[PDB]
Design a protein around this nucleic acid. Structure first.
Ligand SMILES: [Mg+2]
Ligand SMILES: [Mg+2]
Ligand SMILES: [Mg+2]
Ligand SMILES: [Mg+2]
Ligand SMILES: [Mg+2]
Ligand SMILES: [Mg+2]
Ligand SMILES: [Mg+2]
Ligand SMILES: [Mg+2]
Ligand SMILES: [Mg+2]
Ligand SMILES: [Mg+2]
Ligand SMILES: [Mg+2]
Ligand SMILES: [Mg+2]
Ligand SMILES: [Mg+2]
Ligand SMILES: [Mg+2]
Ligand SMILES: [Mg+2]
Ligand SMILES: [Mg+2]
Ligand SMILES: [Mg+2]
Ligand SMILES: [Mg+2]
Ligand SMILES: [Mg+2]
Ligand SMILES: [Mg+2]
Ligand SMILES: [Mg+2]
Ligand SMILES: [Mg+2]
Ligand SMILES: [Mg+2]
Ligand SMILES: [Mg+2]
Ligand SMILES: [Mg+2]
Ligand SMILES: [Mg+2]
Ligand SMILES: [Mg+2]
Ligand SMILES: [Mg+2]
Ligand SMILES: [Mg+2]
Ligand SMILES: [Mg+2]
Ligand SMILES: [Mg+2]
Ligand SMILES: [Mg+2]
Ligand SMILES: [Mg+2]
Ligand SMILES: [Mg+2]
Ligand SMILES: [Mg+2]
Ligand SMILES: [Mg+2]
Ligand SMILES: [Mg+2]
Ligand SMILES: [Mg+2]
Ligand SMILES: [Mg+2]
Ligand SMILES: [Mg+2]
Ligand SMILES: [Mg+2]
Ligand SMILES: [Mg+2]
Ligand SMILES: [Mg+2]
Ligand SMILES: [Mg+2]
Ligand SMILES: [Mg+2]
Ligand SMILES: [Mg+2]
Ligand SMILES: [Mg+2]
Ligand SMILES: [Mg+2]
Ligand SMILES: [Mg+2]
Ligand SMILES: [Mg+2]
Ligand SMILES: [Mg+2]
Ligand SMILES: [Mg+2]
Ligand SMILES: [Mg+2]
Ligand SMILES: [Mg+2]
Ligand SMILES: [Mg+2]
Ligand SMILES: [Mg+2]
Ligand SMILES: [Mg+2]
Ligand SMILES: [Mg+2]
Ligand SMILES: [Mg+2]
Ligand SMILES: [Mg+2]
Ligand SMILES: [Mg+2]
Ligand SMILES: [Mg+2]
Ligand SMILES: [Mg+2]
Ligand SMILES: [Mg+2]
Ligand SMILES: [Mg+2]
Ligand SMILES: [Mg+2]
Ligand SMILES: [Mg+2]
Ligand SMILES: [Mg+2]
Ligand SMILES: [Mg+2]
Ligand SMILES: [Mg+2]
Ligand SMILES: [Mg+2]
Ligand SMILES: [Mg+2]
Ligand SMILES: [Mg+2]
Ligand SMILES: [Mg+2]
Ligand SMILES: [Mg+2]
Ligand SMILES: [Mg+2]
Ligand SMILES: [Mg+2]
Ligand SMILES: [Mg+2]
Ligand SMILES: [Mg+2]
Ligand SMILES: [Mg+2]
Ligand SMILES: [Mg+2]
Ligand SMILES: [Mg+2]
Ligand SMILES: [Mg+2]
Ligand SMILES: [Mg+2]
Ligand SMILES: [Mg+2]
Ligand SMILES: [Mg+2]
Ligand SMILES: [Mg+2]
Ligand SMILES: [Mg+2]
Ligand SMILES: [Mg+2]
Ligand SMILES: [Mg+2]
Ligand SMILES: [Mg+2]
Ligand SMILES: [Mg+2]
Ligand SMILES: [Mg+2]
Ligand SMILES: [Mg+2]
Ligand SMILES: [Mg+2]
Ligand SMILES: [Mg+2]
Ligand SMILES: [Mg+2]
Ligand SMILES: [Mg+2]
Ligand SMILES: [Mg+2]
Ligand SMILES: [Mg+2]
Ligand SMILES: [Mg+2]
Ligand SMILES: [Mg+2]
Ligand SMILES: [Mg+2]
Ligand SMILES: [Mg+2]
Ligand SMILES: [Mg+2]
Ligand SMILES: [Mg+2]
Ligand SMILES: [Mg+2]
Ligand SMILES: [Mg+2]
Ligand SMILES: [Mg+2]
Ligand SMILES: [Mg+2]
Ligand SMILES: [Mg+2]
Ligand SMILES: [Mg+2]
Ligand SMILES: [Mg+2]
Ligand SMILES: [Mg+2]
Ligand SMILES: [Mg+2]
Ligand SMILES: [Mg+2]
Ligand SMILES: [Mg+2]
Ligand SMILES: [Mg+2]
Ligand SMILES: [Mg+2]
Ligand SMILES: [Mg+2]
Ligand SMILES: [Mg+2]
Ligand SMILES: [Mg+2]
Ligand SMILES: [Mg+2]
Ligand SMILES: [Mg+2]
Ligand SMILES: [Mg+2]
Ligand SMILES: [Mg+2]
Ligand SMILES: [Mg+2]
Ligand SMILES: [Mg+2]
Ligand SMILES: [Mg+2]
Ligand SMILES: [Mg+2]
Ligand SMILES: [Mg+2]
Ligand SMILES: [Mg+2]
Ligand SMILES: [Mg+2]
Ligand SMILES: [Mg+2]
Ligand SMILES: [Mg+2]
Ligand SMILES: [Mg+2]
Ligand SMILES: [Mg+2]
Ligand SMILES: [Mg+2]
Ligand SMILES: [Mg+2]
Ligand SMILES: [Mg+2]
Ligand SMILES: [Mg+2]
Ligand SMILES: [Mg+2]
Ligand SMILES: [Mg+2]
Ligand SMILES: [Mg+2]
Ligand SMILES: [Mg+2]
Ligand SMILES: [Mg+2]
Ligand SMILES: [Mg+2]
Ligand SMILES: [Mg+2]
Ligand SMILES: [Mg+2]
Ligand SMILES: [Mg+2]
Ligand SMILES: [Mg+2]
Ligand SMILES: [Mg+2]
Ligand SMILES: [Mg+2]
Ligand SMILES: [Mg+2]
Ligand SMILES: [Mg+2]
Ligand SMILES: [Mg+2]
Ligand SMILES: [Mg+2]
Ligand SMILES: [Mg+2]
Ligand SMILES: [Mg+2]
Ligand SMILES: [Mg+2]
Ligand SMILES: [Mg+2]
Ligand SMILES: [Mg+2]
Ligand SMILES: [Mg+2]
Ligand SMILES: [Mg+2]
Ligand SMILES: [Mg+2]
Ligand SMILES: [Mg+2]
Ligand SMILES: [Mg+2]
Ligand SMILES: [Mg+2]
Ligand SMILES: [Mg+2]
Ligand SMILES: [Mg+2]
Ligand SMILES: [Mg+2]
Ligand SMILES: [Mg+2]
Ligand SMILES: [Mg+2]
Ligand SMILES: [Mg+2]
Ligand SMILES: [Mg+2]
Ligand SMILES: [Mg+2]
Ligand SMILES: [Mg+2]
Ligand SMILES: [Mg+2]
Ligand SMILES: [Mg+2]
Ligand SMILES: [Mg+2]
Ligand SMILES: [Mg+2]
Ligand SMILES: [Mg+2]
Ligand SMILES: [Mg+2]
Ligand SMILES: [Mg+2]
Ligand SMILES: [Mg+2]
Ligand SMILES: [Mg+2]
Ligand SMILES: [Mg+2]
Ligand SMILES: [Mg+2]
Ligand SMILES: [Mg+2]
Ligand SMILES: [Mg+2]
Ligand SMILES: [Mg+2]
Ligand SMILES: [Mg+2]
Ligand SMILES: [Mg+2]
Ligand SMILES: [Mg+2]
Ligand SMILES: [Mg+2]
Ligand SMILES: [Mg+2]
Ligand SMILES: [Mg+2]
Ligand SMILES: [Mg+2]
Ligand SMILES: [Zn+2]
Ligand SMILES: [Zn+2]
Lengths: 112, 50, 86, 249
RNA sequence: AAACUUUCAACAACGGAUCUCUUGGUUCUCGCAUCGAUGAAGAACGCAGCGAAAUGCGAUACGUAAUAUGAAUUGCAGAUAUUCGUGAAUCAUCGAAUCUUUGAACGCACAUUGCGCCCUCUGGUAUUCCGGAGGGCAUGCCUGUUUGAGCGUCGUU
RNA sequence: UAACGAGAUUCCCACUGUCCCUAUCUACUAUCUAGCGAAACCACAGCCAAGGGAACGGGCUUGGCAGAAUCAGCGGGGAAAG
RNA sequence: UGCUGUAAAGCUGGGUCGAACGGCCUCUAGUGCAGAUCUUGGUGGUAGUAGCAAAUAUUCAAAUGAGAACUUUGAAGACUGAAGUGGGGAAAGGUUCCAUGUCAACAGCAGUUGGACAUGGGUUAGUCGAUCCUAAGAGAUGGGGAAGCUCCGUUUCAACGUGCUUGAUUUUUCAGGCCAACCAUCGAAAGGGAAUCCGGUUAAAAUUCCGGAACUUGGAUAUGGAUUCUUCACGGCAACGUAACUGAAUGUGGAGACGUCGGCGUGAGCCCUGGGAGGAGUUAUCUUUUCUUCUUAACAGCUUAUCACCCUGGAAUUGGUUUAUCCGGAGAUGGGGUCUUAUGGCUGGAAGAGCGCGGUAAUUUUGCCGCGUCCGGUGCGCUUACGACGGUCCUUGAAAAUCCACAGGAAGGAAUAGUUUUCAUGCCAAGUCGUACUCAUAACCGCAGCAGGUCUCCAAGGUUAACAGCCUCUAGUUGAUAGAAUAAUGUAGAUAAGGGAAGUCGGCAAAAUAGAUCCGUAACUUCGGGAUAAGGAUUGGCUCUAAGGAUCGGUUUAACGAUCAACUUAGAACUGGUACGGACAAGGGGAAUCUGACUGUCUAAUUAAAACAUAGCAUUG
RNA sequence: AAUAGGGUGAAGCCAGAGGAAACUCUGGUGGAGGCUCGUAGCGGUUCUGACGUGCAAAUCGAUCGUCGAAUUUGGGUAUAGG
RNA sequence: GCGAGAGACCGAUAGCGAACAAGUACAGUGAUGGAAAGAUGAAAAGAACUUUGAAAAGAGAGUGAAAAAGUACGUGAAAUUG
């Protein structure tokens, strides 16, 4: 079987010097240098991988359209659906209870 | 190495030019005492200084 | 194996060319010249090494400016140009 | 003779602490208006391992009272503190695990950790895993409080000094044998270069006051005066007593 | 008796003593006072019709100007070089210039010919981006100029 | 003191040229040739016995003797060299 | 050649030579050599002696040449045997690279040859690295020490922006609006990081040149599309989808970006193999045979996935499920969906390229013509990438540059027209330095072409547990002075009757054992071990036998049919000079004493141990 | 950045058996360990082998220790002569 | 340092380390260390030409006052050698 060599001056098997083995139209077997695999965008609240967002190396996000990088919702590309659902319910219930804690501290300012 | 600096590569160019034999028309000058270039350098024998 | 086998592991230059004196005495990690003391303002020189002063002193280079001070002084530091005689 | 291993540590060439992996300095908040007059509420975001520390650290996010910004503090985690817990800090904070209170607001017998030696130094005493400070009593006229430190010493501190309610998490660590030299190597790999130790009696007289002899022996008393000089203080320095400790102290 | 070994003589070798030289050294005496931010000493790299070194010089590069002198230079070549003359050669002399990258070294940096910003002009349809040409931007301190700061402080509403 | 040990020690089984007691075989040397071609060392040198002697001589004294030029080995001596 | 003098010495004949020198009275001194393991230079004996013996190995012929064991070419015989004697690189070297010429010196023989000598030629980048970021660290500034060279300090007891953003203004003035926690700088050719591939091409360069096909950043900028009269889009219950589809200050997140292993799955490349279309080899005999070509880059579109998530629903007769144990009223099974695009497929790139054949043009730069280049299968395979998992820690396994999204709602926005360069297309530019060659039994360091040392990538077939050993394909070498003999003594390797440690300080050295399957396995023990304890049997070849699956097909006798497919295990017969782990590979075992618990560490270059360390224990501050 | 191929078989998990209970036993599965044989690697035990004017101012051969961690190692960086 | 004049000084192993392309060649990572090396002839007139040889060279010949001066260069000792 044909054996290959690196295509750059780096002779070491580092994380940024990873290669794939590819067969060329010339029937040869040469090394093709691969870029590091991209990591998935993750939720800032729960840490899970966000759905609907492309997995790219960070600079490649600048040259892609916005629909690839977001989801049509509040906190679209930042928080997950369940974390947004919990934010909405928590905001509504706590602010509703804020009214309850206020009116009670006015009923006791005329009887106590 | 293949990867060398400009400062290094410029010194290696001068070392080649200083390694020439004596031009033969110099021995014909009147009262000439130089018979040969006394500052020859072989790569394997004497090392430079880079 | 402290001799010949250990002498095979010499491929990391401690010194490189100095910008002031060009001598290969510039300690790479120390960023100092062991010969002329660069980048210190003063030149490295010692009275216990008088032969080292001989090697680098006035007259060992070109003296591209001190060459002519004697000849300009001898004429009283003329200003102007020489006048052709009639 | 030669410079002994004691004296080479002060130069701190190979004896500085290995701090690449450390997760920040563990401190209380800077004493500000909110803590001096009322209380401020923060939320625990993370509880993380700090290399070189037996105690876990907690990252707690507070709001900035004066500008729109979040401030992340590194507290020493008390046992029972959880992620998402509300931490209350100030004079008016309630007696709940994880809250930061002045010493005068805590009754006698209150178990507290990360206590301030001086007002506003953000925690000095009782910071390691399993340790805590017991509040012994109060002197309200002089605004002072007596506490008992992990060493068993009683100390008098300003009643305005702050502390965190509870015991430092991670206790009981010493109960387990290390079992291996490699375990101690990995333990000190993220602390500092202090392990392993060569016995001074096994070296030569140049290296140590204990070196030399046709048998390994100290030759003179290993209890050294407090007024001895550097290069001499090797052994039991200012030893009040020696031998097996029998009975109570 | 040969050969061999040894001794001697002649010639030839090996080697460079001896003799004789000497643009060098060494020492004494006499006389003089002149480095550098107007960028020194030193370093690197280059420069000749044909040059590697030494010497000289700096992209005007074994030199340009000027003065003196008065026909060369020379190893070869070669004038669109010169001879009763603004005229050959000359570190003879020297007062005008040129003086690369540097170096106390001065935009920042330098094991990189790495990276800025300002002014004027200019090219690419450009105050903003890219290119080019020229001129600038170090630190401490002094005098002065301008712009400021302080319930330190004076007058007045 | 289980386990561990290129740690020190004694014995047993197996095993064998360690031995009785040595023999045979292979390659490379050594050997001869062409070419090439060092080094240590060197007061002078190089046969013995006795004597005396700085009390263990190559030289001295008295004897034995003694015939050119040489080759491979060898390790008694040169109180060999370092 | 002699003479004189006791002598130190003086004089003289002959030869050589070529430019200075002497006698006498005095002055002066760096003034006389056999030594000093003297100094420097030169030269011997030794001596044509020791020797030029590791890395399996050469031979015939032709050519060239004055000259050939050694150069070239051809034929053969061999070796390295993918953990290479192969193909590249980092450090280091610096022209050793390539062509021509060439043998005075060097290549410890030789030389027509060379990494030698001489003359020339040769290294082409927006995409490969530098440059940019920060790491440990280095180190200016305000300052504080020190007589001082300098030391300290890195945001430090500092009034620290050569600030920006707009509307502009063409008034080259401004009006202001926001901010200034942190912020000199250097520091990685292995960390982070914008972007390039294929075919061809040179004597020597190529991800750099040629041809074609792409991509990123910065800048400029028009058209189409998109959007608005409900101004800053629609659809979907939802996960979310899209060619687009406002968004200041300020804030929050994500990517960058992270340990080590275990089994499993998938992919890629390699390995194996069937049909068909070609070429070469063997063919006394056999062999529908053995070997070989049948390939497809970056990039664009569509499609494609474990995990995760959404809708439905309400579960014990608990169910689902991995090789490995977890999940489910905090909503399982079931049904239906959403996402990441890693990876594969189709298509474009792209057959026009390359490859394999056949026919030709011709001293001929270089070709021209025709045909084919297709369809599969297989797997506890190897390597590698990824994935979902599981284990592990008194160990929890960088930073920064940089890029994006979101929150927020400042500000500006339409109807006869307004906005936007995150949708498509179009225009310009990408500077500087390195780039040849060696990477080692000859290009580095060891004085050298030194059996030493020196970081890393790729990795075929057979046997096998194996990337071991042995043989082979590709590739590369056939290099190491040679010739003739074969005494002693050697060095390396073999064998030996009978005895079997009697040798020796001592079993030193050697031998014996050895793979695999089955049986069997003691004291003691910290119950984990001891243990391969000890001690036995078998093993070849051939012909069989048995067992162990995949995918499909329908009232649950599918308990049956069809097709396909891998090497494992066990048993039997026969067979042979009783052989068979047949080469290779490969434990000797047991009973005790001293000692250190163990793994680990040191005297590089005479000591590896009982010495050091260690966990544990105790003491001190 | 690097580290063939085997052996042993720790927790956890599945199934069955016995028992009144407390619990115990068996067959699998699993893949732990500064575990083990043993390459590369790292080291350097013995022959007190070779050599000892060597290939070498420390090498060569066989044999050997360890070989998944207190492992090996490149580069950068820090520590400087009482 | 600059510019001069001198000496009962040394005469190429002396005199400065250096009379010469001397702080040169070369060593060492580095600080540093650091040589050897003058002489044909008045003038190259530096041996045309012929011949043997593959060549270097040799033999004739030529130049020169001398080749008993051939860049291995005046003179040319000793060790050592034919
Ligand atoms: Mg390459
Ligand atoms: Mg990630
Ligand atoms: Mg968060
Ligand atoms: Mg989080
Ligand atoms: Mg989307
Ligand atoms: Mg998408
Ligand atoms: Mg190069
Ligand atoms: Mg060398
Ligand atoms: Mg040097
Ligand atoms: Mg050396
Ligand atoms: Mg090293
Ligand atoms: Mg260093
Ligand atoms: Mg140096
Ligand atoms: Mg100068
Ligand atoms: Mg003393
Ligand atoms: Mg503190
Ligand atoms: Mg240590
Ligand atoms: Mg100790
Ligand atoms: Mg201790
Ligand atoms: Mg000791
Ligand atoms: Mg004492
Ligand atoms: Mg002492
Ligand atoms: Mg002692
Ligand atoms: Mg003791
Ligand atoms: Mg003791
Ligand atoms: Mg005692
Ligand atoms: Mg005779
Ligand atoms: Mg003089
Ligand atoms: Mg320079
Ligand atoms: Mg005139
Ligand atoms: Mg100029
Ligand atoms: Mg100059
Ligand atoms: Mg530079
Ligand atoms: Mg520069
Ligand atoms: Mg820079
Ligand atoms: Mg100034
Ligand atoms: Mg033992
Ligand atoms: Mg041992
Ligand atoms: Mg005993
Ligand atoms: Mg005993
Ligand atoms: Mg024998
Ligand atoms: Mg044999
Ligand atoms: Mg012999
Ligand atoms: Mg011979
Ligand atoms: Mg002798
Ligand atoms: Mg006698
Ligand atoms: Mg005698
Ligand atoms: Mg004698
Ligand atoms: Mg006598
Ligand atoms: Mg006699
Ligand atoms: Mg006799
Ligand atoms: Mg003897
Ligand atoms: Mg001798
Ligand atoms: Mg002796
Ligand atoms: Mg004369
Ligand atoms: Mg004298
Ligand atoms: Mg003498
Ligand atoms: Mg002598
Ligand atoms: Mg001598
Ligand atoms: Mg000799
Ligand atoms: Mg011989
Ligand atoms: Mg030999
Ligand atoms: Mg061989
Ligand atoms: Mg010839
Ligand atoms: Mg040969
Ligand atoms: Mg040969
Ligand atoms: Mg041949
Ligand atoms: Mg083979
Ligand atoms: Mg192998
Ligand atoms: Mg290789
Ligand atoms: Mg390299
Ligand atoms: Mg050349
Ligand atoms: Mg070549
Ligand atoms: Mg050639
Ligand atoms: Mg030779
Ligand atoms: Mg050459
Ligand atoms: Mg570029
Ligand atoms: Mg790049
Ligand atoms: Mg560069
Ligand atoms: Mg740049
Ligand atoms: Mg750039
Ligand atoms: Mg960047
Ligand atoms: Mg830093
Ligand atoms: Mg400093
Ligand atoms: Mg301060
Ligand atoms: Mg103005
Ligand atoms: Mg930088
Ligand atoms: Mg980098
Ligand atoms: Mg890099
Ligand atoms: Mg990188
Ligand atoms: Mg082509
Ligand atoms: Mg083409
Ligand atoms: Mg073409
Ligand atoms: Mg090439
Ligand atoms: Mg653009
Ligand atoms: Mg739309
Ligand atoms: Mg914003
Ligand atoms: Mg992140
Ligand atoms: Mg990283
Ligand atoms: Mg990793
Ligand atoms: Mg993990
Ligand atoms: Mg894995
Ligand atoms: Mg596969
Ligand atoms: Mg076909
Ligand atoms: Mg056949
Ligand atoms: Mg690509
Ligand atoms: Mg049911
Ligand atoms: Mg499994
Ligand atoms: Mg056909
Ligand atoms: Mg056709
Ligand atoms: Mg691999
Ligand atoms: Mg993985
Ligand atoms: Mg994964
Ligand atoms: Mg938004
Ligand atoms: Mg907000
Ligand atoms: Mg919004
Ligand atoms: Mg740029
Ligand atoms: Mg290359
Ligand atoms: Mg290599
Ligand atoms: Mg290589
Ligand atoms: Mg070698
Ligand atoms: Mg080698
Ligand atoms: Mg080579
Ligand atoms: Mg050596
Ligand atoms: Mg050396
Ligand atoms: Mg490595
Ligand atoms: Mg194998
Ligand atoms: Mg392999
Ligand atoms: Mg072999
Ligand atoms: Mg051989
Ligand atoms: Mg022979
Ligand atoms: Mg023999
Ligand atoms: Mg033997
Ligand atoms: Mg035999
Ligand atoms: Mg036999
Ligand atoms: Mg036999
Ligand atoms: Mg026998
Ligand atoms: Mg018999
Ligand atoms: Mg027996
Ligand atoms: Mg027996
Ligand atoms: Mg015995
Ligand atoms: Mg015995
Ligand atoms: Mg005996
Ligand atoms: Mg005995
Ligand atoms: Mg005995
Ligand atoms: Mg033995
Ligand atoms: Mg046998
Ligand atoms: Mg057994
Ligand atoms: Mg046993
Ligand atoms: Mg059988
Ligand atoms: Mg074997
Ligand atoms: Mg044995
Ligand atoms: Mg031990
Ligand atoms: Mg182990
Ligand atoms: Mg050990
Ligand atoms: Mg060590
Ligand atoms: Mg040793
Ligand atoms: Mg040893
Ligand atoms: Mg040992
Ligand atoms: Mg104990
Ligand atoms: Mg205590
Ligand atoms: Mg293997
Ligand atoms: Mg293993
Ligand atoms: Mg064992
Ligand atoms: Mg390996
Ligand atoms: Mg080894
Ligand atoms: Mg042996
Ligand atoms: Mg030996
Ligand atoms: Mg010998
Ligand atoms: Mg053997
Ligand atoms: Mg072994
Ligand atoms: Mg081994
Ligand atoms: Mg082991
Ligand atoms: Mg591990
Ligand atoms: Mg000292
Ligand atoms: Mg000193
Ligand atoms: Mg000192
Ligand atoms: Mg001391
Ligand atoms: Mg002293
Ligand atoms: Mg003068
Ligand atoms: Mg003077
Ligand atoms: Mg005068
Ligand atoms: Mg001299
Ligand atoms: Mg002369
Ligand atoms: Mg002479
Ligand atoms: Mg003359
Ligand atoms: Mg004359
Ligand atoms: Mg002639
Ligand atoms: Mg002739
Ligand atoms: Mg003649
Ligand atoms: Mg004549
Ligand atoms: Mg004459
Ligand atoms: Mg003569
Ligand atoms: Mg003469
Ligand atoms: Mg001569
Ligand atoms: Mg003469
Ligand atoms: Mg002569
Ligand atoms: Mg003589
Ligand atoms: Zn979430
Ligand atoms: Zn310097």
């Amino acid at each position: 079987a044909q054996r290959v060599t690196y295509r750059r001056r780096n002779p070491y098997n580092t994380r940024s010097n990873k290669i794939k083995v590819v067969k060329t139209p010339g029937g040869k077997l040469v090394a093709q240098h691969v870029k590091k695999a991209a990591s998935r965008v993750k939720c800032g609240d729960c840490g899970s991988a966000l759905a609907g967002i492309s997995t790219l190396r960070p600079r490649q996000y600048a040259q892609v359209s916005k629909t690839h990088k977001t989801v049509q919702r509040a906190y679209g590309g930042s928080r997950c659906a369940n974390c947004v659902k919990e934010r909405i319910v928590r905001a509504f219930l706590i602010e509703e209870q804020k009214i309850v804690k206020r009116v009670l501290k006015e009923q006791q300012d005329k009887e106590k | 190495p293949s990867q060398k600096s400009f400062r290094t590569k410029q010194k290696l160019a001068k070392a080649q030019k200083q390694n020439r034999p004596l031009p033969q028309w110099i021995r014909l000058r009147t009262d000439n005492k130089i018979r040969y270039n006394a500052k020859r350098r072989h790569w394997r024998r004497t090392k430079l200084g880079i | 194996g402290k001799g010949t086998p250990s002498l095979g592991k010499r491929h990391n230059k401690s010194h490189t060319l100095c910008n002031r004196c060009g001598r290969r005495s510039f300690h790479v990690q120390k960023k100092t010249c062991s010969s002329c003391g660069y980048p210190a303002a003063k030149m490295r020189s010692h009275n216990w090494a008088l032969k080292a002063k001989r090697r680098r002193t006035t007259g060992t280079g070109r003296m591209a400016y001190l060459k002519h001070v004697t000849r300009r002084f001898k004429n009283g530091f003329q200003t102007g140009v020489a006048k052709a005689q009639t | 003779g030669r410079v002994i291993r004691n004296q080479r540590k002060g130069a701190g060439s190979i004896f500085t602490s290995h701090t690449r992996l450390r997760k920040g300095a563990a401190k209380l908040r800077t004493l500000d208006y909110a803590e001096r007059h009322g209380y401020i509420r923060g939320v625990v975001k993370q509880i993380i391992h700090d290399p070189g520390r037996g105690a876990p650290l907690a990252k707690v996010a507070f709001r900035d009272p004066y500008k729109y910004k979040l401030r992340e503090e590194t507290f020493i985690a008390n046992e029972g503190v959880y992620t998402g817990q509300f931490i209350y800090a100030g004079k008016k904070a309630s007696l709940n695990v994880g809250n930061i209170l002045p010493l005068g607001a805590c009754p006698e017998g209150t178990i507290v950790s990360n206590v301030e030696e001086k007002v506003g130094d953000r925690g000095a005493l009782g910071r390691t895993s399993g340790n805590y400070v017991i509040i012994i009593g109060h002197n309200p006229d002089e605004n002072k409080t007596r506490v008992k430190l992990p060493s068993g010493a009683k100390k008098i501190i300003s009643s305005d000094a702050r502390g965190v309610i509870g015991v430092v998490a991670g206790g009981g660590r010493i109960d387990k044998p290390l079992l291996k030299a490699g375990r101690a190597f990995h333990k000190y790999k993220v602390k500092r270069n202090s392990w392993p130790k060569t016995r001074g009696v096994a070296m030569n007289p140049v290296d140590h006051p204990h070196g030399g002899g046709n048998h390994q022996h100290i030759g003179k008393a290993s209890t050294i005066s407090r007024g001895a000089v550097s290069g001499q203080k090797a052994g039991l320095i200012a030893a009040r007593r020696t031998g097996l400790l029998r009975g109570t102290q």
